[PDB]
Design an enzyme around this catalytic site. Sequence first.
Site, PDB file in Angstrom:
ATOM      1  N   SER A  49       0.759  -1.225   0.000  1.00  0.00           N
ATOM      2  CA  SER A  49       0.000   0.000   0.000  1.00  0.00           C
ATOM      3  C   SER A  49       0.812   1.312   0.000  1.00  0.00           C
ATOM      4  O   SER A  49       0.215   2.367  -0.256  1.00  0.00           O
ATOM      5  CB  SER A  49      -0.991  -0.023   1.152  1.00  0.00           C
ATOM      6  OG  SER A  49      -1.793   1.134   1.124  1.00  0.00           O
ATOM      7  N   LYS A  52       0.665   3.935  -2.890  1.00  0.00           N
ATOM      8  CA  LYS A  52      -0.308   5.050  -2.880  1.00  0.00           C
ATOM      9  C   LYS A  52       0.383   6.382  -2.743  1.00  0.00           C
ATOM     10  O   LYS A  52      -0.052   7.354  -3.343  1.00  0.00           O
ATOM     11  CB  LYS A  52      -1.373   4.886  -1.779  1.00  0.00           C
ATOM     12  CG  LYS A  52      -2.551   3.998  -2.186  1.00  0.00           C
ATOM     13  CD  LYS A  52      -3.512   3.820  -1.028  1.00  0.00           C
ATOM     14  CE  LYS A  52      -4.249   2.487  -1.071  1.00  0.00           C
ATOM     15  NZ  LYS A  52      -3.302   1.435  -0.642  1.00  0.00           N
ATOM     16  N   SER A 298      -6.173   4.184   3.492  1.00  0.00           N
ATOM     17  CA  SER A 298      -5.604   3.499   2.361  1.00  0.00           C
ATOM     18  C   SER A 298      -6.737   2.984   1.477  1.00  0.00           C
ATOM     19  O   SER A 298      -7.085   1.815   1.553  1.00  0.00           O
ATOM     20  CB  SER A 298      -4.786   2.340   2.891  1.00  0.00           C
ATOM     21  OG  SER A 298      -3.723   2.031   1.999  1.00  0.00           O
TER      22      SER A 298
HETATM   23  B1  LIG Z   1      -2.327   1.747   2.333  1.00  0.00           B
HETATM   24  C1  LIG Z   1      -2.617   1.029   3.737  1.00  0.00           C
HETATM   25  N1  LIG Z   1      -3.312  -0.207   3.408  1.00  0.00           N
HETATM   26  C2  LIG Z   1      -2.942  -1.446   3.749  1.00  0.00           C
HETATM   27  O1  LIG Z   1      -1.932  -1.714   4.418  1.00  0.00           O
HETATM   28  C3  LIG Z   1      -3.857  -2.518   3.200  1.00  0.00           C
HETATM   29  C4  LIG Z   1      -3.195  -2.758   1.881  1.00  0.00           C
HETATM   30  C5  LIG Z   1      -3.734  -2.196   0.731  1.00  0.00           C
HETATM   31  C6  LIG Z   1      -3.095  -2.378  -0.491  1.00  0.00           C
HETATM   32  C7  LIG Z   1      -1.912  -3.132  -0.551  1.00  0.00           C
HETATM   33  C8  LIG Z   1      -1.378  -3.700   0.612  1.00  0.00           C
HETATM   34  C9  LIG Z   1      -2.011  -3.488   1.837  1.00  0.00           C
END
Ligand SMILES: *B(*)CNC(=O)Cc1ccccc1
EC number: 3.4.16.4
Length: 466
Positions: A49, A52, A298
């Site tokens: 994540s 992002k 997220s």
């Molecule tokens: B961005 C924060 N989100 C997470 O940790 C859940 C997630 C989302 C996408 C990829 C890996 C983990």
Amino acid sequence: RLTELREDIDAILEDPALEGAVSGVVVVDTATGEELYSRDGGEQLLPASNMKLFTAAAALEVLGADHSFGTEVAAESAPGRRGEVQDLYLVGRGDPTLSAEDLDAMAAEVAASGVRTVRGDLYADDTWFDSERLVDDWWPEDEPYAYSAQISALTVAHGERFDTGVTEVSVTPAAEGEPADVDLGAAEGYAELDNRAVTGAAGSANTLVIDRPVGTNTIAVTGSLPADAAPVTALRTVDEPAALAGHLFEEALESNGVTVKGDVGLGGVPADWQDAEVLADHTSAELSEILVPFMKFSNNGHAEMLVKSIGQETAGAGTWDAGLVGVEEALSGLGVDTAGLVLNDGSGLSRGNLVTADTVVDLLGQAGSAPWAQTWSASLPVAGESDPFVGGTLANRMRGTAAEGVVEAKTGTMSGVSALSGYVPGPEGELAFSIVNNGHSGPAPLAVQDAIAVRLAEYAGHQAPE
Ligand SMILES: *B(*)CNC(=O)Cc1ccccc1
Ligand SMILES: [Mg+2]
Ligand SMILES: [Mg+2]
């Protein structure tokens, strides 16, 4: 002073939880550019994540802090004396935060414009993006869950987190031996139900499974809910987010006196309409505001919609292909060196993504002196902060520590991949760090991530609050 720190971080990485794991760790004082720590800063790793970070930066660069998203309703011509239009079109343009209530407000606008009957079909138009719902390598066994929701230009967002393309399912025990009661939320009369769930004896074992079997639009519920259990709710994805947007919109028109005589389906606004009558519109909030529920929690749906919105901006093609080139460019334009990056999606969900930790730290540098720095850093989860819209995915981590209220970072965890990257602001200097872990096989090294972040906050000159 700087030498002591370096050894500590060595010791925190001796943790037996990082066994068989490559681990990228980089820390940069931002006022100088002096590198405080580097180990494997240039190793390419799955970012989960943290990807992002990259997407969010690009969205601000390409779309603007000021950018907002629109949805409209269209007929071929306005209605008349009799208040009749033929076919109606709900046209969405990549709003990630569209609610059922905004749909109801638009339904009322359609009523206040004098339509009393849609005589033809109601069409859901999400053609502002392409119809590739999922990234190629995302896992099919994953598709029933919110973070894996199908991508679309016209998607109904649920709750104040604006989880898109999902419905809420609620399962209530009845009397022992009777079927559980299942409530499909928004998706009622849209998605099929297959309910085989039963109520078990009071105080027996909860074995309830709520599924969407792959490549269907059916919510299959199985198992046994204890007579005395609290009501269970789960967010599940539906097939074809737009079509559900459509469904919900017919219901809203009915509730606003506007009758539909026809069908609800997927359809684009025909090319041979000369001057469409826009009977209703909604504008979302601005990106800088939307950044918050996206980054704090997220939001994967938001990430990918944002990518497809970048592809529309730089090329007029709501496509992963175009948007990803879009993000790379934007980052480059930012002064970021994107050599180590492989971009395969915007959320980080894809296992084709790769980053290095120098790259992440690099991003954090550049995004730090950007015109839109404050709206960027305000979207990051803040360690230990209990209010969900401040803490986010860091709400229940690093409480009671020097990190509480200070460290702002993005998280990211899936099988064998965990990451923490962001800022440690302080009296001393504003620090920027990235911690990415691959290979590990037990629980995620969150203790480790925390240990480091807490050391930095102390190095920067903070004390644990008591
Ligand atoms: B961005 C924060 N989100 C997470 O940790 C859940 C997630 C989302 C996408 C990829 C890996 C983990
Ligand atoms: Mg319904
Ligand atoms: Mg403090």
